[PDB]
Amino acid sequence: SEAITHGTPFQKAAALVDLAEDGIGLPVEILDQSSFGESARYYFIFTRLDLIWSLNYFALLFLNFFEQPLWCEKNPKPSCKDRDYYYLGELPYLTNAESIIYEVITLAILLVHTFFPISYEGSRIFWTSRLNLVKVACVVILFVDVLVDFLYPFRIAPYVRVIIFILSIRELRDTLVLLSGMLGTYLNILALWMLFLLFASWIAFVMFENTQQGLTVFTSYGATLYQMFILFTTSNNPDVWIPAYKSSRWSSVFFVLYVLIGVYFVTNLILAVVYDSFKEQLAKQVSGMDQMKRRMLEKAFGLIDSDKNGEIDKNQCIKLFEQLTNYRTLPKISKEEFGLIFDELDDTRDFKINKDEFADLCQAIALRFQKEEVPSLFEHFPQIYHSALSQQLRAFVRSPNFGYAISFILIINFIAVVVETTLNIEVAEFVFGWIYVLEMALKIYTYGFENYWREGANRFDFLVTWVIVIGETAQWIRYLLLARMLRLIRLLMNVQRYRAFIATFITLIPSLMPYLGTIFCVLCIYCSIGVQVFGGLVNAGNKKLFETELAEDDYLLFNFNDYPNGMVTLFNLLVMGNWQVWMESYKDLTGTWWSITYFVSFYVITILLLLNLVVAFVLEAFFTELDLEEEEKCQGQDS
Amino acid sequence: SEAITHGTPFQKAAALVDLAEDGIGLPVEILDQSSFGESARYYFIFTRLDLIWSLNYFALLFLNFFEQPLWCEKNPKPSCKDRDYYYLGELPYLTNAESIIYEVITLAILLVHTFFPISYEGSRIFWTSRLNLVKVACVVILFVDVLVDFLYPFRIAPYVRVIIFILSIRELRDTLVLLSGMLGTYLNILALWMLFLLFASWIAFVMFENTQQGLTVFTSYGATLYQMFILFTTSNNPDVWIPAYKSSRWSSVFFVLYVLIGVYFVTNLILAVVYDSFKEQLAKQVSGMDQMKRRMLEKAFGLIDSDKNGEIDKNQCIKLFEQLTNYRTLPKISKEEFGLIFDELDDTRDFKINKDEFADLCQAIALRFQKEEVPSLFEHFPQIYHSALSQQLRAFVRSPNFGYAISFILIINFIAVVVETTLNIEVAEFVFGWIYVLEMALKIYTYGFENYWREGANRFDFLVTWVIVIGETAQWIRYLLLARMLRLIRLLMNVQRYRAFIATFITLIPSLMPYLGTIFCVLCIYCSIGVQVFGGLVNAGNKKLFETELAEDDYLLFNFNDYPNGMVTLFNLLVMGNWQVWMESYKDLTGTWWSITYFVSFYVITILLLLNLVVAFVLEAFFTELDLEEEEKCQGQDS
Numbered sequence A, B: 001s002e003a004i005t006h007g008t009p010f011q012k013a014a015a016l017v018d019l020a021e022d023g024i025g026l027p028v029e030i031l032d033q034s035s036f037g038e039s040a041r042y043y044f045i046f047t048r049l050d051l052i053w054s055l056n057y058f059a060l061l062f063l064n065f066f067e068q069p070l071w072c073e074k075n076p077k078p079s080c081k082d083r084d085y086y087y088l089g090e091l092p093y094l095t096n097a098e099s100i101i102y103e104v105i106t107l108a109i110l111l112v113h114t115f116f117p118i119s120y121e122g123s124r125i126f127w128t129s130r131l132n133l134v135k136v137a138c139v140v141i142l143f144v145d146v147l148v149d150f151l152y153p154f155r156i157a158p159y160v161r162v163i164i165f166i167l168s169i170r171e172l173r174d175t176l177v178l179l180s181g182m183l184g185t186y187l188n189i190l191a192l193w194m195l196f197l198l199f200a201s202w203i204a205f206v207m208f209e210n211t212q213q214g215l216t217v218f219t220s221y222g223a224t225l226y227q228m229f230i231l232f233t234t235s236n237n238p239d240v241w242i243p244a245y246k247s248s249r250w251s252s253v254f255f256v257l258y259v260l261i262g263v264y265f266v267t268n269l270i271l272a273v274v275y276d277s278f279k280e281q282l283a284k285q286v287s288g289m290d291q292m293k294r295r296m297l298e299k300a301f302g303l304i305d306s307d308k309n310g311e312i313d314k315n316q317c318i319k320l321f322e323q324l325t326n327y328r329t330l331p332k333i334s335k336e337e338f339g340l341i342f343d344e345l346d347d348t349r350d351f352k353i354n355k356d357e358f359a360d361l362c363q364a365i366a367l368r369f370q371k372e373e374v375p376s377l378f379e380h381f382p383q384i385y386h387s388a389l390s391q392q393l394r395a396f397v398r399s400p401n402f403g404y405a406i407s408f409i410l411i412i413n414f415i416a417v418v419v420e421t422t423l424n425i426e427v428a429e430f431v432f433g434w435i436y437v438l439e440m441a442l443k444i445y446t447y448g449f450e451n452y453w454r455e456g457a458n459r460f461d462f463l464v465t466w467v468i469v470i471g472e473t474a475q476w477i478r479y480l481l482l483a484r485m486l487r488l489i490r491l492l493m494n495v496q497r498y499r500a501f502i503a504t505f506i507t508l509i510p511s512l513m514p515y516l517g518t519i520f521c522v523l524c525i526y527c528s529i530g531v532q533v534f535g536g537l538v539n540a541g542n543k544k545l546f547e548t549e550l551a552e553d554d555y556l557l558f559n560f561n562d563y564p565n566g567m568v569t570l571f572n573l574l575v576m577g578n579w580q581v582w583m584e585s586y587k588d589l590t591g592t593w594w595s596i597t598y599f600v601s602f603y604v605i606t607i608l609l610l611l612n613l614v615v616a617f618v619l620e621a622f623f624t625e626l627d628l629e630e631e632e633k634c635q636g637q638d639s
């Protein structure tokens, strides 16, 4: 029935097309699994045991990574007044009973995942791999740190759990390779940036020693390097230069010129470079993906010929199309695609195919023809009861007006909830959960499970959906109604006036899970530093606190006293909304100026990753939507 | 001796090459001046009288445009307590004696400039031109508004003086054509932006009616459209949602998600479109410049042939090269540049050149060969005294080691001023002005005046230089020293690690006088509205003032009470440094909510002009520096 498990046959024609399939969605086979003379050994039976059991790991990888808000402050134990939540968080900290029990679950599924591939690698290959060397070394640190915390330094567990989580998921590991290639270009331009403040912190220190400014703010030199740095951010534009503006108006024409050159040229010209190297790293990554295509299709070509003369005949290629489980038609499609595929010299009558010549053909059936779909029938015991009865169900759903009725009836679904909100006031709340699950139970069986996972954001829907079922067993549904109308703006994207915008903006939701995943990881590093470095300062009873800007502006909850409060407090520093409130606080709270180098180290690293990974990527991928909108209507007219 | 004035001869070969010169720097000749059968009539004698006398107009155009800070508040006359400078400016307002005297100068040189091209256009052409029609109509309003002031409404003079000044200078007029072509794309995407606030102002109004938030901030719906708009700017990130964060921590996950989608996607996806249409408007402007090349070189081709059979012979083309007066020796360089120019007809062997074929040749001598230089000798009475003696001078300066000694001895020039600063404490200040003018008096005589004007930013230097001489006749020299070391960072751009950055940043100083000129003009519109609309509100003795954020944050010097205080207040609103202090003030000072639509109109219009004309242009022009750096080393190796 299916095409999933078949690595045990894997004939001349059987799994050879699935090798050609792995160019299409580009799944990975390890090069050693491609290296073998059989290339389908007992090792590879274990390899496909991973990619079926993969989503077990995201109930580890996210599970390990989100442990860190649930953990304690570093220092409640020296403290007095412990259990007072003076500005702390709301999640309960897991005590040493609940500490260790969560971690035996965690270090199990690591060791299964990390010592998985020796099932399909040689030990001299596993233990040689520099990527693998780090992840095993990151295991043992946790494997130590679990065992030490049982019997019971600054506790470097939670720095590692990020770096396991970065290296584990292939998006975040692919992403981070760029910031080895970008970083050699970014750091050289940073020396030219760092020069721009220093040159222009020097003049305004020199210029305003004489006036009221050096009496007030610009006392030290490094108290101008501090201040004219904050003007480069412009979260401080009038408050810096009031007493230079108040005395003579002609000091604005300095500061309105420095900020102007600072923001509107340089922070574009940092963006210009970081957008320029991102172009060159993206292709160098992409051509690093197509050698994985060519080193797959070489295996797809080398599996065919036994003589390995370098050539496959047309019927020898048509028998691939017959073993393709093909679309519906094969009389002359290769004969149709002879000249249509870019170049054939057509020397011999049919049987002139080179190793390069095939690599266009499997991509052409992927791009234009879109031939294949995996049924994935059943497990074999209830199958025939349901395989007959599915033809009385899945006749209904595969009818596309009913598929439009999946869009049409989804309009009805949110309409009842508005009036029912008031009238439930004038459990009953769990009753409407049954209506929500019902529509999504249908198309799972129509599609198939990973066929449901291949769908765009309906993938993301069932991610939301089951937790809604889980969250009701342990009001909010009112605010959770909005996800239904959220996909009705996916009917806005067919509007031609507003197309290439929402063509981007919906495509850019899966396109920025890596590059916004990494930024979430960088915060989980910077928070865990702020927990350890800046932990217990903002007290109830601190008297150096209340004269600082966190008290006047009342941002006391934006605080590093725990982990999750520091997790939000990084976010405003990431946004640049009044981010100097914290920087001028902790220069007074820790009391010395080495705390300043925390937040600048945030800025230099964030305004790579913002100017790179968010901002510069959209201006690429909008152009991918744009020309594929234009060259759909161009080659809708052209050929 | 000279090559300037020669439109009175203009032989078959004489001014014909100067037609080919007018493709090189691309100066403009009007199409009617190209239309004529003579094309060098008595009209065109007056046309070159303009472009020599052009810099007389910038002592009008800047003169007219900078008049507006020197003028009065709209309303001191109803007021009590006039001559108290309660938060006012510092420039003296020109009284009605000095008001009119400045304007007879001004309306003279307009009328000379505006009724100039009747000297070279027909009356049915001058008065048909709608680009001319507006400027004449803008004259008469000022011609009225001067005469009304002499014989003693809201005084719409100063709106016009900008719009004369925009249409007068060809940079600002070329720029503004784009924002007719961009605006049809920008406004359609704005309706999708405007939708994003409204959709998401609606939820947080709905979501937080129940909690503390709707008690505090989110009372009205339109008081969330107000606030969630300011979160789109993020000049207000924690202060908006404290009491939604203070009560339940889980309401940050709204706001940290809304801002995230708001800033990092949409304000890139406004930038992506506005950078995309700027690409398409720039080329459409540029191909609008090359038809001006082709409709010049058609005149350059049509002036040659008397039979107009369509062909020019090789010697008939070589006699251009002899008349060109730009190379050393020319026996077979046409024969060198035959096949080197992309395609030759070569039919009737040396003599078959099409109208298209020449257009590469005139561009090739400008680009690659580049042997033109205009001598511009003297006026004819002191000429031979100096022209003989210049060969005893300009033997020195055109020697390239002395040209490096213009770079080398300029390094010495700033060094003495640091120690001399302290020792002048222990007029003498005007003595060091003589050293500064001296070095720039040299190369002018070596180059020539407009030859000095063709230079990159040394052009800008003499603009600085003479006002220094003027400003000393009517301390600051210390801060004026810095312009010498300012050009030593032009010896940093030859460093290969930092080249393509400063290749941009120095080329982008002339490249953003238009697109930062327009933004300067938009403020002079918005200030003049703020003078008239928001003029006299911020009193000394206002009692609704001191409880507002302009008093607490103490930005009281940033009113638009006068003109130039509102010129600078618009700067901070352009930067986005605490710009909601003003918006929440003037909603209390004028007291009703129509003042809000002032500052949003400043946002929507400027965050086109920032995201367009500043930001998106740099990411183009950095790529122009980048590939011309690469394809200098590529075709330094290739051909």
Ligand SMILES: CCCCCCCCCCCCCCCCCC(=O)OC[C@H](COP(=O)(O)O)OC(=O)CCCCCCCCCCCCCCCCC
Pocket (backbone or CB within 6 Å): A058, A168, A169, A170, A171, A172, A510, A513, A514, A516, A517, A518, A520, B260
């Ligand atoms: C707080 C909870 C966060 C929830 C976010 C859920 C994201 C769902 C991802 C689940 C899939 C795990 C696969 C990731 C890597 C393994 C292989 C692979 O390449 O799959 C690619 C996967 C699709 O490929 P396939 O499913 O393997 O076929 O693409 C993705 O969508 C996920 C890529 C990165 C996911 C982790 C990074 C982001 C997580 C943290 C987010 C924090 C805040 C972000 C705010 C942005 C708001 C817009």
Ligand SMILES: CCCCCCCCCCCCCCCCCC(=O)OC[C@H](COP(=O)(O)O)OC(=O)CCCCCCCCCCCCCCCCC
Pocket (backbone or CB within 6 Å): A260, B058, B168, B169, B170, B171, B172, B510, B513, B514, B516, B517, B518, B520
């Ligand atoms: C406050 C005083 C501002 C001083 C700025 C000086 C501006 C230089 C003007 C040069 C002479 C006037 C020519 C412009 C009219 C078009 C004719 C032409 O082709 O010349 C183009 C000229 C070069 O071409 P050429 O000299 O004719 O060969 O290019 C330019 O450099 C000037 C182009 C626009 C000038 C007016 C717009 C800007 C003025 C307002 C500045 C305020 C904001 C600037 C802040 C940014 C800081 C980095």
Ligand SMILES: CCCCCCCC[C@H](CCCCCCC(=O)O)C(CCCCCC)CCCCCCCCC(=O)O
Pocket (backbone or CB within 6 Å): A089, A090, A091, A516, A519, A520, A523, A564, A565, A567, A568, A571, A574, B248, B249, B250, B252, B253, B256, B257, B260
């Ligand atoms: C590079 C851009 C990355 C975006 C920055 C991180 C976003 C901040 C989110 C975490 C902090 C809020 C947690 C509040 C905890 C508390 O104070 O109780 C955060 C990420 C959410 C996932 C998608 C957003 C980007 C975590 C949200 C969890 C909320 C927990 C609140 C507890 C509720 C209770 O009362 O128990």
Ligand SMILES: CCCCC[C@@H](CCCCCCCCCC(=O)O)[C@@H](CCC)CCCCCCCCCCCC(=O)O
Pocket (backbone or CB within 6 Å): A249, A250, A252, A253, A256, A257, A260, B066, B069, B090, B091, B516, B518, B519, B520, B523, B564, B567, B568, B570, B571, B574
């Ligand atoms: C879109 C961004 C445009 C950038 C240009 C901005 C100004 C740069 C320098 C121009 C200076 C003009 C001086 C004219 C003299 C006068 O009218 O006062 C600039 C645009 C803001 C974005 C605005 C800032 C200019 C403010 C000038 C104030 C000087 C007042 C001095 C009076 C007191 C005295 O001289 O004694």
Ligand SMILES: CCCCCCCCCCCCCCCC(=O)O
Pocket (backbone or CB within 6 Å): A195, A198, A199, A202, A220, A221, A222
């Ligand atoms: C581009 C650099 C040029 C100007 C460089 C400025 C470096 C000056 C360093 C001085 C540091 C502090 C000076 C006075 C304060 C003190 O005595 O410590």
Ligand SMILES: CCCCCCCCCCCCCCCC(=O)O
Pocket (backbone or CB within 6 Å): A194, A197, A220, A221, A222, A223, A225, A226, A229, A593, A596, A597, A600
């Ligand atoms: C990247 C440029 C600056 C980065 C962070 C700003 C550093 C400015 C210097 C800090 C304060 C100056 C030294 C204090 C003087 C003192 O000890 O009295």
Ligand SMILES: CCCCCCCCCCCCCCCC(=O)O
Pocket (backbone or CB within 6 Å): A220, A221, A222, A223, A225
């Ligand atoms: C990689 C490091 C980045 C650069 C860090 C900036 C180092 C300069 C620190 C400035 C301190 C100068 C203040 C001394 C003057 C004084 O205290 O009187």
Ligand SMILES: CCCCCCCCCCCCCCCC(=O)O
Pocket (backbone or CB within 6 Å): A154, A159, A163, A525, A529, A532, A533
């Ligand atoms: C993923 C890499 C980890 C990043 C580097 C972490 C170590 C840098 C500084 C750590 C602590 C610095 C301050 C310690 C002072 C203290 O504990 O009181």
Ligand SMILES: CCCCCCCCCCCCCCCC(=O)O
Pocket (backbone or CB within 6 Å): A222, A592, A593, A594, A596, A597, A600, A601, A604
């Ligand atoms: C990675 C770039 C970070 C840049 C910021 C560096 C922090 C420098 C701190 C400057 C403080 C001045 C030195 C005196 C220290 C002290 O007085 O305690």
Ligand SMILES: CCCCCCCCCCCCCCCC(=O)O
Pocket (backbone or CB within 6 Å): A522, A525, A529, A533, A590, A594, A595, A596, A597, A598, A601, A605
């Ligand atoms: C991607 C990881 C980046 C890591 C850089 C962050 C570490 C720089 C500063 C951390 C805290 C140092 C300042 C603490 C001052 C103190 O000891 O009191």
Ligand SMILES: CCCCCCCCCCCCCCCC(=O)O
Pocket (backbone or CB within 6 Å): B195, B198, B199, B202, B220, B221, B222
């Ligand atoms: C995308 C739009 C969907 C939601 C649109 C929300 C429009 C609601 C309009 C209500 C305005 C004020 C409502 C209560 C205040 C009043 O009674 O005036």
Ligand SMILES: CCCCCCCCCCCCCCCC(=O)O
Pocket (backbone or CB within 6 Å): B194, B197, B220, B221, B222, B223, B225, B226, B229, B593, B596, B597, B600
């Ligand atoms: C572009 C989106 C918004 C633009 C400016 C914000 C408009 C907010 C609405 C004004 C405040 C509330 C309206 C009146 C309420 C009242 O009169 O009580």
Ligand SMILES: CCCCCCCCCCCCCCCC(=O)O
Pocket (backbone or CB within 6 Å): B220, B221, B222, B223, B225
């Ligand atoms: C081109 C115009 C842009 C759109 C301008 C905003 C239009 C909506 C104004 C919001 C007012 C709604 C407030 C009414 C609710 C109330 O006062 O109770």
Ligand SMILES: CCCCCCCCCCCCCCCC(=O)O
Pocket (backbone or CB within 6 Å): B154, B159, B163, B525, B529, B532, B533
């Ligand atoms: C260059 C175009 C000019 C811009 C438009 C100018 C007129 C728009 C509004 C002008 C005044 C606004 C209302 C005046 C109220 C008052 O005078 O009290």
Ligand SMILES: CCCCCCCCCCCCCCCC(=O)O
Pocket (backbone or CB within 6 Å): B222, B592, B593, B594, B596, B597, B600, B601, B604
């Ligand atoms: C050009 C776009 C500007 C958008 C801002 C529009 C200003 C709308 C003002 C909203 C105020 C609510 C209406 C009530 C007026 C009043 O009470 O005086």
Ligand SMILES: CCCCCCCCCCCCCCCC(=O)O
Pocket (backbone or CB within 6 Å): B522, B525, B529, B533, B590, B594, B595, B596, B597, B598, B601, B605
């Ligand atoms: C490029 C020119 C843009 C012109 C747009 C600015 C005019 C919009 C609002 C001007 C002031 C209107 C608000 C004043 C309300 C009042 O009279 O109190």
